[PDB]
Paper text:
The polypyrimidine tract binding protein (PTB) is a well-characterized regulator of alternative splicing although it also has significant roles that affect the processing, localization and use of a variety of mRNAs. Three tissue-specific homologues of PTB have been identified—smPTB, ROD1 and nPTB—all of which have high levels of amino acid sequence identity with the prototypical protein (69–74%) and are therefore likely to have very similar structures. smPTB (smooth muscle tissue) has so far only been found in rodents (Gooding, Kemp & Smith, 2003), whereas the homologue ROD1 is expressed primarily in hematopoietic tissues. nPTB is found predominantly in brain and testis but also, at low levels, in muscle cells. PTB (and its homologues) contain 4 RNA recognition motif domains (RRMs) separated by long flexible linkers and arrayed, when not bound to RNA, in a relatively extended, linear conformation.
In each case the required tetrahedral coordination appears to be completed by Cl− ions and/or water molecules.
Author numbering: 337 to 419, 424 to 531
Amino acid sequence: NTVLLVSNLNEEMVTPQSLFTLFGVYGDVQRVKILYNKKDSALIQMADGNQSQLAMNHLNGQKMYGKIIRVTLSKHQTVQLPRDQGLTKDFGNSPLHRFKKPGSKNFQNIFPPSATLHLSNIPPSVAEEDLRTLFANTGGTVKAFKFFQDHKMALLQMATVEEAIQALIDLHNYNLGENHHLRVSFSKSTI
Ligand SMILES: [Cl-]
Ligand SMILES: [Zn+2]
Ligand SMILES: [Zn+2]
């Protein structure tokens, strides 16, 4: 039970990489396949069954590129790679897998989709106005913002959960300069 079926996707907007990013919040996505004969649906293979049931539980019914997605357990056992239009993607041993490290289930901010995002790996002389503008530019409005004591991390509250999902998809691993890539997670905290 490692393969999720995700339907009612936005056929025109969704990519494998956006599905990687979003489902990678809850597990390590091994492979994605958008279906050729039903491009609003896709198969997603997690590393294991706990990851699959977690992703299903938290993402089913959430709004992604404007549409309410449905996430169920697939009838498939694995997601087969092809011998094209890039509907398939292999993400084996991705450097972007959050749950590489032993015990990581507790240190990746595993929470339901939340209007407040948790930012980490921020480099110095990234200002607040800089992060507000970057997040606002994903099409949302930034309601609140708070640095933690070192400015390596921050909370940032978009107007809605929908807008936070969009931002997370867009800006996780964003290059903020120096050699710092931003990490965006959900949060149960509030500013
Ligand atoms: Cl299918
Ligand atoms: Zn099938
Ligand atoms: Zn640093």
